[PDB]
């Protein structure tokens, strides 16, 4: 139960591994470095 790349988050904590949520609009689980 985690959120994949390009899924709308509220925070990194609501993303799958290898992703860091944008802390700006739009807020999606985004490519941190690997994916």
Coordinates of N, CA and C in Angstrom, one line a residue:
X1 N 0.9 -1.2 0.0 CA 0.0 0.0 0.0 C 0.9 1.2 0.0
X2 N 1.5 1.6 -1.2 CA 2.2 2.8 -1.3 C 1.9 3.5 -2.6
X3 N 2.4 4.7 -2.9 CA 2.0 5.4 -4.1 C 3.2 5.5 -5.1
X4 N 2.9 5.2 -6.4 CA 3.9 5.1 -7.4 C 4.3 6.4 -8.1
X5 N 5.3 6.4 -9.0 CA 5.7 7.7 -9.5 C 4.5 8.4 -10.1
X6 N 4.5 9.8 -10.0 CA 3.4 10.5 -10.6 C 2.1 10.3 -9.9
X7 N 2.0 9.8 -8.7 CA 0.8 9.7 -7.9 C 0.7 10.8 -7.0
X8 N -0.5 11.5 -6.9 CA -0.6 12.7 -6.0 C -0.4 12.3 -4.5
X9 N 0.6 13.0 -3.9 CA 0.9 12.7 -2.5 C 0.5 13.9 -1.6
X10 N 0.6 13.7 -0.3 CA 0.7 14.9 0.6 C 2.2 15.0 1.0
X11 N 3.0 13.9 1.2 CA 4.3 14.0 1.6 C 5.1 12.9 1.1
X12 N 6.5 12.9 1.2 CA 7.3 11.7 0.8 C 6.8 10.5 1.6
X13 N 6.4 10.6 2.9 CA 5.9 9.5 3.6 C 4.8 8.8 2.9
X14 N 4.0 9.5 2.0 CA 3.0 8.8 1.3 C 3.4 8.4 -0.1
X15 N 4.7 8.0 -0.3 CA 5.2 7.5 -1.6 C 5.9 6.1 -1.4
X16 N 6.1 5.4 -2.5 CA 6.9 4.2 -2.5 C 8.3 4.5 -2.4
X17 N 9.2 3.5 -2.2 CA 10.6 3.7 -2.1 C 11.1 4.3 -3.4
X18 N 12.4 4.9 -3.4 CA 13.0 5.4 -4.7 C 12.2 6.7 -5.1
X19 N 11.3 7.3 -4.4 CA 10.6 8.5 -4.8 C 10.6 9.5 -3.7
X20 N 10.6 10.8 -4.0 CA 10.6 11.8 -3.0 C 9.5 12.8 -3.5
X21 N 8.5 13.1 -2.7 CA 7.4 13.9 -3.2 C 7.8 15.3 -3.5
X22 N 7.3 15.9 -4.6 CA 7.6 17.3 -4.8 C 7.1 18.1 -3.6
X23 N 7.8 19.0 -3.0 CA 7.3 19.8 -1.9 C 6.8 21.2 -2.5
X24 N 6.0 21.1 -3.6 CA 5.6 22.3 -4.3 C 4.5 21.8 -5.2
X25 N 3.6 22.7 -5.7 CA 2.5 22.2 -6.6 C 3.0 21.9 -8.0
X26 N 2.6 20.8 -8.7 CA 1.8 19.8 -8.1 C 2.5 18.9 -7.2
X27 N 1.9 18.3 -6.2 CA 2.6 17.5 -5.2 C 2.5 16.0 -5.6
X28 N 3.4 15.4 -6.4 CA 3.3 14.0 -6.7 C 4.5 13.2 -6.3
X29 N 4.4 11.9 -6.1 CA 5.5 11.1 -5.7 C 6.5 11.1 -6.9
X30 N 7.7 11.8 -6.7 CA 8.5 12.1 -7.9 C 9.8 11.5 -7.9
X31 N 10.5 11.5 -9.1 CA 11.7 10.8 -9.3 C 12.8 11.3 -8.3
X32 N 13.2 10.7 -7.3 CA 14.2 11.2 -6.4 C 15.5 11.1 -7.1
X33 N 15.9 9.9 -7.6 CA 17.1 9.6 -8.3 C 17.0 8.3 -9.1
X34 N 16.8 7.2 -8.4 CA 16.5 5.9 -9.0 C 15.0 5.8 -9.1
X35 N 14.5 4.8 -9.8 CA 13.0 4.5 -9.9 C 12.8 3.1 -10.4

